[PDB]
Amino acid sequence: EEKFEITGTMRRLADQSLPPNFSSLENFRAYVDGFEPNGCIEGKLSQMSKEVNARIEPFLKTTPRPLKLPDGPPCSQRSKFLLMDALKLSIEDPSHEGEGIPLYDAIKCMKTFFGWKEPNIVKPHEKGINPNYLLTWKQVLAELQDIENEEKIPKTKNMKKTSQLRWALGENMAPEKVDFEDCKDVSDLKQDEPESRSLASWIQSEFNKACELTDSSWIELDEIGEDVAPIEHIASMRRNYFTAEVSHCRATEYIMKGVYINTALLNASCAAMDDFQLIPMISKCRTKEGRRKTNLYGFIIKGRSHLRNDTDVVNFVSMEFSLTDPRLEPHKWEKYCVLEIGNMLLRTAVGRVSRPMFLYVRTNGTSKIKMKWGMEMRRCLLQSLQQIESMIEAESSVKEKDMTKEFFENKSETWPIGESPKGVEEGSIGKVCRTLLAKSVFNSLYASSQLEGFSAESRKLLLIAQALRDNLEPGTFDLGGLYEAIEECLINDPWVLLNASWFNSFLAHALK
Amino acid sequence: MDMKRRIHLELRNRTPAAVRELVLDNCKSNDGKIEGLTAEFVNLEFLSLINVGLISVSNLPKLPKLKKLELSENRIFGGLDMLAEKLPNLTHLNLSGNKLKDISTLEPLKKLECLKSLDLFNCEVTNLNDYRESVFKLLPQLTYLDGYDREDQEAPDSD
Amino acid sequence: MDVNPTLLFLKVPVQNAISTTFPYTGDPPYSGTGYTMDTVNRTHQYSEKGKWTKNTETGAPQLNPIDGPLPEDNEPSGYAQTDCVLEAMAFLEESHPGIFENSCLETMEIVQQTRVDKLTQGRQTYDWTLNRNQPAATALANTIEIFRSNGLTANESGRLIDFLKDVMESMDKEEMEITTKQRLNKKSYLIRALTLNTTPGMQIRGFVYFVETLARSICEKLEQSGLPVGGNEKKAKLANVVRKMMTNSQDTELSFTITGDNTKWNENQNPRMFLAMITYITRNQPEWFRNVLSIAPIMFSNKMARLGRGYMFESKSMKLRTQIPAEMLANIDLKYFNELTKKKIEKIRPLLIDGTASLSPGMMMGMFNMLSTVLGVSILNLGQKRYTKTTYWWDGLQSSDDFALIVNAPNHEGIQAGVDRFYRTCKLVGINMSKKKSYINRTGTFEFTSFFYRYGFVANFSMELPSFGVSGINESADMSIGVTVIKNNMINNDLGPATAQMALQLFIKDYRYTYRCHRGDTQIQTRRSFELEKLWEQTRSKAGLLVSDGGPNLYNIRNLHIPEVCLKWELMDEDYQGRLCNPLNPFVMEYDAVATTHS
Amino acid sequence: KNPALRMKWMMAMKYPITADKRIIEMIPERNEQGQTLWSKVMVSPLAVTWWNRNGPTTSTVHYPKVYKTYFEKVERLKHGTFGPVHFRNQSVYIEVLHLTQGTCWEQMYTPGG
């Protein structure tokens, strides 16, 4: 019907693509039109060298070596906020919820702690002039006093752009953009292998405290219509059990703290761009007796933030309270500078003891993608639930009965989550619900390309082990290459190295 | 200040039986071991060794009634079983800041039936999941761990 | 205790708790010109045998691997054999009589009825006028406008084929004028029309759509292909294939399975070989239909790669930073770079012309996903015990670069020989099985495109969780879009009802915070906290109130498809129904417009 | 662009909603507490509640008929009888698929009517 013709500049192009034996598209079209199979594949295979083969290497309980973790100085903290070292100054006073302006809550929180002492530096940063970290805290205290003195709370404070706050915020500008012709003849224009770091105990302890129950209810999910379908009843059973076992977990505290902090940062950066705005670090939790509460972990001083592209980075200075002395695990605190804020009297076995109260100050940076990813931490609760539900549904498909009650309504079930110096410890459902949630929250907090390249490559080495444990005679074409692919991801990430160390433990105990 | 000299200094010439409380905070341990403390302190109801640099408690003498002990901020790593035999009537023990790392090191305290309050702040043992539950189920006689009870309610101040 | 969630697999199998090995629920917050150079260098390294030419139009060197020396080692090879590809396609047609004739018949009905507007239904596309990426609609509009600036106007007919004719004519113009007034030579326009950016230009996208449409029909007709299908339907394929192999009676044969990954899949597929099979599929067809399809492989074989932006330099001694574009990399001193980038520059310099690398031999990612699946399916077809002439035989599934193979042989040596005759035949057509991402195990447990099969139970985890939240249109849309997404992923992505319920809660907790629809019972104080309260007081059936007006949330799993208004209608107050819609409103898959439809 | 964040920021401020000029007479400028329901025209969302709270009423039942399929779905769900669940090994039905069929369970459900 139509007339789509190939003419010069497209016939000439078409005459140079076809294989290297024809000199025109018409010749090749005619050759293909007159093609009948004549056992070409068999002849080519016979001619092909026998070195081109896929030899199946048997996979036996002895083959799997433990993964080789990197070597070097111990890793260090990377999170935006302190995870298990956080100290909360709480109010326990509602204001009808929601309406309360954050800065007033920060003032009230700071008023509940008597014992402030003149700040002193305990752990120098070692890579920036330690002064101007002390002065930032002094300045924040001064402006807090100024706000208190004035009759009316401004409801949005803006720090004075002093010298110390400028240096801390990274205003040590990067070299100005210039023209390559201007700097054609200079010393060098070199455009950097990442340093390799080994495991440290702290990352394993931080995940132990992220699996523990707290005394406060951190997640208050909204209503759902009444349940009238049996499937709705089963779904409500699973969801309610998971929520009850998870609502008090510290992983949920991390979720809510991150959500609040990232929301505050994003709103402040999109609202007040030119000046440095003081953003309190606040999170609201309901206690064990139904009384609201408002916890102040610390302060965030935002920097100049004009963000058009997502990747544009805003630099802020985060100052978090804590009671964890830095001299216990110094290698963990390599990016923070530590000040001695005060003395807090806490109950010991013998009377009450005065323990120092520290502040961890770090100049961090975050873009808009790292704010939106961080306001969605509440979707970590929606992933652990699906993990638990997938296990339940798999073990219910193996059988032909709803195993929701055999999972949750059974005190005898115990999964091997943990390892003490006595054997694999087993915890009931509820430490598995909170353990998968901790894993999801830490995947969100410590997200990196290394983790995404280790989870994918370490899943293949896991299904082969499962096949061996199911007596399916696993075989691998190249197992040395798979180990290399796994190990190229273990470089310096504290989270990924831990997941590797977990893998070694599983292989040793699973195959033995 | 050495223990041998400082015990005499604290005594103020008072006889060992006449002292109810002896405080030896921030001392210089003799080779990391107690020295100068003997059984003559029969009535000693309060002994403190904060920031003493102690690394072993195997030199501790036998005291019949010592309800309060304060070993926090030392370098003790093990050998706690001695406390069970040398101090059969120990009630309040503080071990914050020591180098205890395994729950097994706390097993000997199970012998002490008078123990009711234990504190382990800044100890690496507190970095395990279910640390409170493990310690309580190991020492069922305890009621105030790290200053809090089993129900995470702060202890009254009368103790 | 020291919690260790990977030990969970000591009790539950790994195919049951596999969700724990997928880290993220969405796109992670991370991610240049250094990677493109490596891509082209590897593409030309895997095919450095026997022939280099010089294109007479663009004057760019081209490497022709096809019909090259046969591989003699296990490294990836792109020396596809034209004889073997044609033989494989011929056997594919033989085993499925009329597969290619029917596919062509059903594509001639789509090349004459495809509006040019279909080119706007896509993602970012390279724009040949501005020389930078622009959305599909903007790039198409710019191309049409510049074509109209010249004597090219057939695209006004409203048919994509006419736009293809216009671009074919434009390729002939001695000089092309663009105003926003610069005119480009013939060579320059070809280089700018046969260029792939860091994505192909608007000229190519017209033909590639038609080629993909033809491949889609073949893939649908192929039982072994599992690319076009998705979700639950794909779960019916995996088991199905395992049902074909294992099922047997009084059988001494043993069956093994291969979870497979194809290494450097895109860098070894060659457009010259794709032309060899588009020429076989389109046989005894109208010469106009064969011409339109071949143009996409013809351009792809001469494509050129744009080397992103470039490298950024900085010197601390004088504290100055600069950014040299990639166009000048052709003639730049190597003193400034480091050893690895220096080697990359040395290896890439001969190829590049006009600031773009001539990437002839390979194919960039994502362009021929479906057609590339026909080749793999053709190879999988060659194992039937009728084209094998031996005791062993194989069958399986393939989608793009991920395949699953099953081999049934009397002995272990029979299996090992069946695997070899598939790996080698794959090497003949340029398909390279990845030996560092594959494993073998007895049938009954394997993986395919993140669908994990274990003893007849298939777990689907290919797709990540969506974003359950306010879309951002208006009150009556978000509440009909979030609760529609939840339902859709419940039916498509198979997310368990417990997660659907908790997804409906994390959404309503967002719809109730952005719009300040915090309900009348709660004591939440805001700007809107006043009116809502009294709307609560003067109503009897409080269930009738919409969530937008502080009413109760009545959605559960059972009624996630019904719109909110029609759900609550039967229990709304007539005094409130009248006010709710009242067509004379000052304000006005979402529908059922009401007063809560602002803009 | 991130439409969700834009909606949040826009609902934060006053008078985000666009409106016709009819609102001048239809809705007052204030309420009992004296909060600006609109401004010269830009309209605050608080006006939408006012119209639904105390505004021009109506007694029309034409909606049950303009949207016939949706009310039919509501009726079939309200008059539909459920059945026992069955966990097993791996046009109304098309729409209630999210109930009737699952990954490893089947919900025996009849829509009725």
Residue numbers in the entry:
A (entry chain A): 202 to 392, 396 to 716
B (entry chain D): 1 to 159
C (entry chain B): 1 to 31, 35 to 183, 209 to 226, 243 to 632, 655 to 665
D (entry chain C): 41 to 80, 89 to 138, 226 to 248
Copied sentences from the primary study:
FluPol, composed of the polymerase acidic (PA), polymerase basic 1 (PB1) and polymerase basic 2 (PB2) subunits, transcribes viral genes and replicates the vRNA in the nucleus of infected cells. Replication of avian IAVs in mammalian cells is hindered by species-specific variation in acidic nuclear phosphoprotein 32 (ANP32) proteins, which are essential for viral RNA genome replication. Here, we present cryo-electron microscopy structures of monomeric and dimeric avian H5N1 FluPolA with human ANP32B. All experiments presented in this study were carried out with H5N1 Tky05 FluPolA with the PB1 K577E and PA Q556R amino acid changes.
We determined the structure of a monomeric FluPolA in complex with ANP32B at a final resolution of 3.1 Å. The endonuclease domain of PA (PAEndo), the CTDs of PB2 (PB2-C) and most of the highly acidic ANP32BLCAR (amino acids 160–251) remained flexible and were not resolved. The ANP32BLRR domain (amino acids 1–149) makes extensive contacts with the large CTD of PA (PA-C). The PA 550 loop (residues 550–560)38 forms a β-hairpin that inserts between the ANP32BLRR and the resolved N-terminal section of the ANP32BLCAR (residues 150–159), with the hydrophobic residues A553 and V554 contacting the concave face of the ANP32BLRR. PA R551 forms a salt bridge with ANP32B D159, while PA R559 interacts with ANP32B D119 and D146, in addition to π-stacking with F121. PA R556 forms two salt bridges, with ANP32B E154 and D157, confirming its role in strengthening the interaction with ANP32B. ANP32B interacts with the PA subunit of FluPolA in the monomeric form, at the site used for its docking onto the C-terminal domain of host RNA polymerase II during viral transcription. Comparison of the ANP32B and RNAP II CTD binding sites suggests that their binding is mutually exclusive. FluPolA pull-down is dependent on ANP32B concentration, while absence of ANP32B signal on the gel confirms that it does not bind CTD peptides itself, i.e. CTD binding is mediated solely by FluPolA. These data suggest that ANP32B can outcompete RNAP II for binding to FluPolA, in a concentration-dependent manner. Altogether, our data suggest that newly synthesised, RNA-free FluPolA binds ANP32B as it enters the cell nucleus, and that this interaction prevents binding to the RNAP II CTD.
